[PDB]
Symmetry: C2
Subunit: 170 residues, 2 copies
């Protein structure tokens, strides 16, 4: 048993409640596994949309959150009310908002094989055009992602909309 014995999940969540809040906000259950199993807390808001080449499974265990999405070309909102499960198809752009303190969502995805890339995108609040997109070989979420986001926030050139010139707030 490379990942240990079964264990009580609510107890696990309580014991890590101090990570399920800012600044870290999320914690991965098992390490070096093909299934990436994460518990995400709150509060947290973000402006980035994730373009994940594989599926994402959500189970909102405690509290509520929601997913800003793009569907057919429209800004839509998928609610994760407490007790909801959701399976997100590949490449559906999504920006999870987790406003509630003390909330917990089980998120399961899997390791991306070599050459299968994740995208992170920002759209313009004014005209809705794509503002900036970074493709990344996601090997470690908590590690390849903060500095990527920091560079977008720190460059007005990246935040500048190619269509209307509005500078995204970051």
């Amino acid at each position: 048993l490379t990942y240990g014995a079964p264990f009580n999940f609510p107890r696990w969540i309580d014991e890590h409640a101090h990570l399920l809040k800012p600044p870290v906000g999320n914690r991965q259950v098992w390490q070096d596994s093909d299934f990436i199993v994460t518990v995400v807390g709150g509060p947290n808001h973000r402006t980035d949309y994730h373009d994940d080449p594989l599926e994402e499974f959500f189970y909102q265990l405690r509290g509520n959150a929601y997913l800003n999405l793009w569907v057919d070309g429209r800004r839509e909102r998928a609610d994760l009310k407490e007790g909801d499960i959701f399976l997100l198809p590949p490449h559906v752009r999504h920006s999870p908002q987790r406003p509630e303190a003390g909330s917990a969502c089980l998120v399961i995805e899997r390791q991306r094989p070599a050459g299968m890339l994740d995208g992170f995108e920002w759209y313009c609040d004014a005209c809705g055009h794509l503002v900036h997109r970074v493709e990344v070989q996601l090997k470690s979420a908590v590690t390849d992602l903060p500095p990527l986001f920091e560079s977008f926030y720190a460059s007005e050139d990246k935040r500048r909309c190619p269509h209307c010139g509005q500078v995204h707030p970051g």
Copy 2:
């Protein structure tokens, strides 16, 4: 959204409680998805060990169950007490026992690519040698599996231990 909107999971489980019991016993949440998401009920006991080439994630939502396993070469038992989560590494032989009526376990695995095969095994209760093993390209669980099991139960030749001659009960 190829798999629909979020939805309340406890409600879903209640509404399918009549499938989470014999003869069917389990129900898959979404169809034609890369993540195979299943809710397994009870009661059910079985003698087969599954050799799955990919990981299996368990979350025992209601009631209790357990997993007979082989580890290093020993018969071991992994308990799924209500509220336990568990991640099973690939190829660890496992035979889930689900004795409790009205129980529910979330089981998540993924579609096997072409040429990656599942194995199903039976061991001898007397000397512990391997008695019979079928490799299968698992494309649909509820479909390729009953007739496979029916053939093992129906053939004393398959149940006959190569080491000691005891005929497995099936």
